Amino acid sequence: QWSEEVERKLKEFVRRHQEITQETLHEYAQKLGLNQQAIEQFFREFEQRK
Amino acid sequence: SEEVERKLKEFVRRHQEITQETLHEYAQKLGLNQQAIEQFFREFEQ
Amino acid sequence: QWSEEVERKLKEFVRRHQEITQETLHEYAQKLGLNQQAIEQFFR
Amino acid sequence: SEEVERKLKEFVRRHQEITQETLHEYAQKLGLNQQAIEQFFREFEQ
Numbered sequence: 001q002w003s004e005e006v007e008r009k010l011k012e013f014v015r016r017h018q019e020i021t022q023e024t025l026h027e028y029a030q031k032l033g034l035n036q037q038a039i040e041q042f043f044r045e046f047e048q049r050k
Numbered sequence: 051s052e053e054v055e056r057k058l059k060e061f062v063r064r065h066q067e068i069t070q071e072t073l074h075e076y077a078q079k080l081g082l083n084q085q086a087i088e089q090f091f092r093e094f095e096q
Numbered sequence: 097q098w099s100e101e102v103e104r105k106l107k108e109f110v111r112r113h114q115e116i117t118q119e120t121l122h123e124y125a126q127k128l129g130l131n132q133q134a135i136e137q138f139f140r
Numbered sequence: 141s142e143e144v145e146r147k148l149k150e151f152v153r154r155h156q157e158i159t160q161e162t163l164h165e166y167a168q169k170l171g172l173n174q175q176a177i178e179q180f181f182r183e184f185e186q
Contacts, residue, residue, distance in 0.1 A: 001097050001184070010106065011091060013177040017113070018084050020173060024166045025077055031158045032069060039062055039151045046144065047055075058144055061135040065155070068131060072124045079116045087109040094102060110174070121163075132152070 003097070007095070009177060009180050010102070013106075013173060014084075014087055014091065014109070016173045017109075017170065020166070020169045021080055024162065024169070025073065027165075028158070028162045029073065031162065032155070035151065035154050035158060036062075036066055038154075039148070042147055043055075043059065043062075046147075054141055054144070057135060057138050058148060061131065061148070062151070064131045065128065065152075068124070068127045069155075072120065072127065076116070076120045079120070080113065083109060083112045083116060086112075087105065090105050094099075135148075
């Protein structure tokens with residue numbers, strides 16, 4: 001035990017938990033952004049054909 | 051008619067709004083939980 | 097050297113994160129469901 | 141009317157798949173992080 005190494009490891013666990021969450025939420029929003037662009041494009045293409 | 055076009059576009063807009071609001075709420079709740087554990091480590095170290 | 101309080105706080109952090117996720121997903125499904133049933137009940 | 145409704149079906153399906161896959165990936169990454177701290181503590185075992 002090093003109260004030091006243990007403290008370091010716990011703090012890194014908490015930091016990484018937040019890092020993983022932020023990276024996930026951004027990726028999710030990006031992929032949703034793309035799915036939304038796609039259905040918008042369909043609506044336009046459908047209208048063009050009217 | 052253009053009425054179908056209206057309802058379908060609104061369905062999609064509401065789907066997006068629900069998604070946006072819920073993602074914001076989720077991030078806020080997770081952020082408070084994160085604040086809580088970080089505050090605990092600060093206090094504990096003091 | 098071992099802190100039960102630190103152990104329990106960390107386990108609660110992880111528990112609350114899971115709970116927030118499960119509750120958020122459930123709420124998200126409810127809200128999307130209300131919206132879907134509206135577009136369906138528009139017809140006709 | 142029907143062809144638009146079917147295309148909206150695929151949008152809704154795709155949004156569900158994006159959400160489900162994102163949740164799986166998120167769980168996997170948090171899992172690795174939790175496993176790492178668990179492994180650190182198992183080093184204290186005789």
